[PDB]
């Protein structure tokens, strides 16, 4: 079982498994049931931006998701990730569809991690490439040539597939914490466009950090968001 820490943009309420009963953003620490959630008005067909911010000092993992009309959800959760993550992780984006579906389109992704006492990794993808050799693609995720990362299967005619799951992880392992670093901080930002014409968009996109070998857990579509093998 991979270790996962994730911010999820959860477009579909599986109130079954402790989602709230609206779309939400949530902070997931080793479980798809978020330790914390905030109501989130997904704007179908609109390009949102999620920011994810943590530092080892404040020990508060925060996320905001907003859209251009300014509507914003925020969630923060106090957690010492040193006690959750392995020292080295990969960072990634993950998305799933289920019985309902949506595009899970990432227009851009950036990430920074810093260990200060400085080691640092920053990458930014404002355009994705067809053969993006720094991105590890999993499940239905593809990139290129519209400059996008399609986390889940879209069809030839621009149509969000159901029953879909994919992720992209930055190629280089990140050293997310180092026990002598006085500050270990990361931030990530991604811009996304979730569009659906279905009866309910589902299921969402997550930014995640995981052990360096993480892969899509089996049957992790719809509600499990490609991050966890199950709903515990």
């Amino acid at each position: 079982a991979d270790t996962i820490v994730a911010v999820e943009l959860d477009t579909y309420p599986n109130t079954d498994i402790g989602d709230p009963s609206y779309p939400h953003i949530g902070i997931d620490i080793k479980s798809v049931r978020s330790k914390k959630t905030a109501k989130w008005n997904m704007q179908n067909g609109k390009v949102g931006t999620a920011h994810i911010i943590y530092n080892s000092v404040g020990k508060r993992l925060s996320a905001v998701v907003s859209y251009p009309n300014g509507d914003s959800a925020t969630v923060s959760y106090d957690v010492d990730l040193d006690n959750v993550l392995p020292e080295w992780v990969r960072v990634g984006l993950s998305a799933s569809t289920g019985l309902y579906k949506e595009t899970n389109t990432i227009l851009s992704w950036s990430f920074t991690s810093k260990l200060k006492s400085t080691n640092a990794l920053h990458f930014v993808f404002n355009q994705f490439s067809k053969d993006q050799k720094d991105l590890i693609l999993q499940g239905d995720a593809t990139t290129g040539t519209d400059g996008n990362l399609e986390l889940t299967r879209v069809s030839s005619n621009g149509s969000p597939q159901g029953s879909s799951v994919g992720r992209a992880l930055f190629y280089a392992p990140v050293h997310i914490w180092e026990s002598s670093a006085v500050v270990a901080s990361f931030d990530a930002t991604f811009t996304f466009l979730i569009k659906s014409s279905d009866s309910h968009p589902a299921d969402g996109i997550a930014f995640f950090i995981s052990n360096i070998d993480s892969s899509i857990p089996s049957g992790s579509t719809g509600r499990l968001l490609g991050l966890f093998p199950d709903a515990n």
Copy 2:
């Protein structure tokens, strides 16, 4: 009365005015009595590093101060600075001595602020100059040519003066928050060397943010750290 938000490295306990009764780092929101403090073992003659981290999402202003042997104090305080600071501020470093004294030597200072929806300001001074035209010097603060910023008066023979106060503020106003920014974050880092041979080092160094016109408040040496006119 200037508006001040500050992280203070407070080397001397004025338990009189609610210091704890040890040296401490503290978070000051509009008052020299810190909303929050942490015990701090000042290492005389050793070069410490303070990091200060805030973002409008987590709304938690955090500071750590460490030294090379790894000893560290941290303090964090939950505060929405949008409700404390003016939209535009200057950022600065401040230090004072009183009846006791110390060097308040800044070897480096860096700062970053970002407003994302990005506007950003980053500066870094790993060496200060004699005529440092981007730094507004106040009170006893001088820079150049040892590459240092002497926040307070030192004497020709390397001797920390008593009864001393100075600050350096970055020349450009910073736009610390902007009501449409989805994330307003700042961080600052400075490295310092507080040395004294006196009976007690005093009084400390602060990183502060203030209205753009802030100046040293009158008689703000020793305990008031050059930040506030008084101890309320």
Copy 3:
């Protein structure tokens, strides 16, 4: 007489004063007649991006201007700016109109300077503010609230004024070179939209570096681009 180094996006040929006889980008070292120019197809009403790159090692000041259809002009000029600029400068953007006119609209501006042996200044304005306290506005230049910097006068009805000149300089002096720095580098980027319906767009926008007190030289509209008092 201010010292000026500039990259000019020169929309109008004053073949009179050694412009080439097409619009051009040029590198200006202390003179409006560029030491170097490249043909430039200004795309009326289109948002272009200029990048300006120099480092004290290669001693080559380079500029490219491009537009989204990919059309690009480049100009580079080998120059040791240590021998041209004062150690401290301000950096700015400048634009003018003459008998012909255009919008000189800056949508974004970023700048970085670094002195390594590191001191560094980076700012980025992806949105300008009405009361932009880190930007020194000169001549007709205004900012806010469309998020733009209007270097020259526009009229209430969106109309580019003739006979116009303005600039914006970053508030903080920059330390552009330091004789012990092993590398002194800067880069700047700005995005602009030059639009005109006139018979000929004129006259252009420049990014410039100048002594810290630089102001618009008298009658520096049209061809002189707000940078020089005359055409020598």
Copy 4:
């Protein structure tokens, strides 16, 4: 045959194979015989810093190497790397010893590449780790726990081995050029300590860029610097 572009800090004159007949820094484009060299006074046992700067606009690859007493060599070479490198490369550091030997100790390494029209990769290693999962180590190169990268074999007693070669490449492929990028720039910086007590230090350290699969070419010690299979 790997494609290599490298800046070499060449401590030993193999005037045999067109080294100049002093230690030098050189720019290597697909050949160990530098297209360009500059005399370089290696300071035995002193910690030098090399900066490497290229951008697709100026098309000038520049390097300076300096030491703290200020002594500096520079070399620049005009080259359009788009025509030399594959679109995706790895970036690395390489070092060798021969009949003579030296420490090839890297204290820090940073790299940035940017494709603007922005994609970007920046990493910085100011401390290396024992199990540095973002660094691909080759030949004798080891890292950890003194915080250093030992490109070549050192012996238990701090002794630079002869006949040694190693490299470290950043784990993630870098996208060094992209035919729509208006500016493709990179820079790299590393700090190193070359120490020897031998009759002549040899042979040097290079920063290099190569195809993503590059490995040490066979018998690439001493003069070939771990970069090329031979001296053509």
